[PDB]
């Protein structure tokens, strides 16, 4: 988390809120209102698994939910708002000056890590839902975002042994997300903030001096 990292997440926030909200809310309501009928469980950690539930069955439940969630994101190119498409392309070109090889990967990871996945894990706090989903859904959404991040980072699971069974799923969807990233990446009391940090703006190495006066006239009122 640096200032430029804050700037990027802010642009995703103020421009993609309506984008995420209308994209994830239908799938979430299908996961809660529907499929609450059965004992849907996404628990794939064996040491955490109840004796009554089945590992093979829960593993399928996770991949099905992850599949339609991933499909809805990849197929959402025609609904991507233009302000972000400008942010990701601006991010695409600047890194390409120093890392021209696979520079598109950095855009897609930050896209999923700082924008898509945090709203998937916590839909209520992101403003997408009216209340938190049931506890069994919250465990599945957290596990799904771990899979979706592996796809975005183009890296297999190598840490937790219970996420390796999904490596075949993430290895196949590598380039589908890579195509989606290549798509979206191609085309106030300010004076109160100014004067509070105005002290010694001229520490550099004309405009900083000029600026100190406007800060002293506007801010001190």
């Amino acid at each position: 988390n640096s200032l430029a990292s804050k700037i990027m997440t802010f642009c995703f926030k103020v421009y993609g809120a309506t984008y995420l909200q209308k994209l994830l809310d239908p799938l979430l309501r299908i996961v809660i209102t529907s499929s609450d009928w059965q004992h849907v469980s996404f628990e794939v950690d064996p040491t955490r698994l109840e004796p009554s539930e089945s590992l093979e069955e829960n593993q399928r439940n996770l991949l099905q939910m992850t599949e339609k969630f991933f499909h809805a994101i990849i197929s959402s190119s025609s609904e991507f708002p233009p302000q972000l498409r400008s942010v990701c392309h601006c991010l695409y070109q600047v890194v390409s000056q120093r890392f021209p090889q696979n520079s598109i990967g950095a855009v897609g990871s930050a896209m999923f890590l700082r924008f898509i996945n945090p709203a998937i894990v916590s839909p209520y706090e992101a403003g997408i839902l009216d209340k938190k989903p049931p506890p069994r859904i919250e465990r599945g959404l957290k596990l799904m975002s771990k899979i979706l991040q592996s796809i975005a980072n183009h890296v297999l699971f190598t840490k937790e042994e219970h996420m390796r069974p999904f490596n075949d799923f993430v290895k196949s969807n590598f380039d589908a997300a890579r195509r989606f990233f290549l798509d979206i990446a191609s085309d106030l009391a300010l004076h109160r903030l100014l004067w509070n940090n105005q002290e010694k703006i001229g520490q550099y190495l004309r405009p900083f001096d000029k600026m100190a006066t406007l800060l002293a006239y506007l801010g001190p009122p």
């Binding site: 001096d209 000029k210 100190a212 006066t213 406007l214 002293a216 006239y217």
Partner: protein, 240 residues
């Protein structure tokens, strides 16, 4: 301050402060001549005269923001408003040889900072940015040309007290220069170094070198003098 006519100048500077608020009616014919007076006076003499001379500039800038005869743009007016703000800063107090005071006004109505020409350079470019901003809006004026002539006259003529100040100003304000003017400046530098064989001389050397600094961006692209001035600088550094 020693000069045979110092009192006569000091008196007129006093009048000029009082007049300067009424100069809100006056400035349009005068503005160059007032900065010519500022240029010589800017930090000189007893502290009350310095305070007066700071006030003189403040009041002139304010007068340029409101003369009912003028029609400056919102950009030009904003530049002047920000200039008033800038001249009100402690930085400009030190430039005018004011230190140890809350308000220049109070003292206006010695601990000479032994005058640093770099301070006059700073003032002069600020007054130049004021004049330039205005001159865009008033195409029918001759102000900078008259200031150039007035400063030029005093820069080139022999007068140990004023000539350094004038050279600094001439250099700062000018928009063109000739090899014959540079010859006169470097001849002044040389004559000032002869006088060092025989403080005032040193201030004249500093002035000529500052003048050469401002003047050298003006010189013609194929002039030898750009290369020559590097050695003028080297020789100056050698002085210690």
């Amino acid at each position: 301050e020693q000069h045979l006519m110092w009192d006569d100048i000091a008196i007129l500077a006093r009048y000029m402060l009082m007049l300067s608020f009424n100069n809100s009616l006056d400035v349009a014919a005068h503005l160059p001549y007032l900065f010519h007076v500022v240029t010589f006076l800017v930090a000189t003499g007893p502290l009350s005269l310095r305070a007066s001379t700071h006030g003189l500039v403040i009041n002139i800038i304010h007068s340029l923001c409101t003369c009912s005869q003028l029609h400056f743009s919102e950009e030009t007016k904003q530049v002047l408003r920000l200039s008033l703000t800038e001249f009100s800063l402690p930085k400009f107090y030190l430039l005018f040889g004011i230190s140890k005071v809350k308000s220049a006004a109070v003292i206006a109505f010695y601990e000479r900072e032994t005058f640093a020409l770099t301070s006059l350079e700073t003032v002069t470019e600020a007054l130049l940015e004021i004049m330039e901003a205005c001159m865009r809006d008033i195409p029918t004026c001759k102000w900078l040309d008259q200031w150039t002539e007035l400063a030029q006259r005093f820069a080139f003529q022999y007068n140990p007290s004023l000539q350094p100040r004038a050279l600094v100003v001439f250099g700062c304000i000018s928009k063109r220069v000739s090899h014959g003017q540079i010859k006169q400046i470097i001849r002044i530098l040389s004559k000032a170094l002869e006088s060092c064989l025989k403080y005032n001389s040193q201030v004249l050397i500093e002035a000529t070198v500052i003048a050469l600094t401002k003047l050298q961006p003006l010189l013609n692209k194929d002039s030898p003098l750009h290369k020559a001035l590097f050695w003028v600088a080297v020789a100056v550094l050698q002085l210690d």
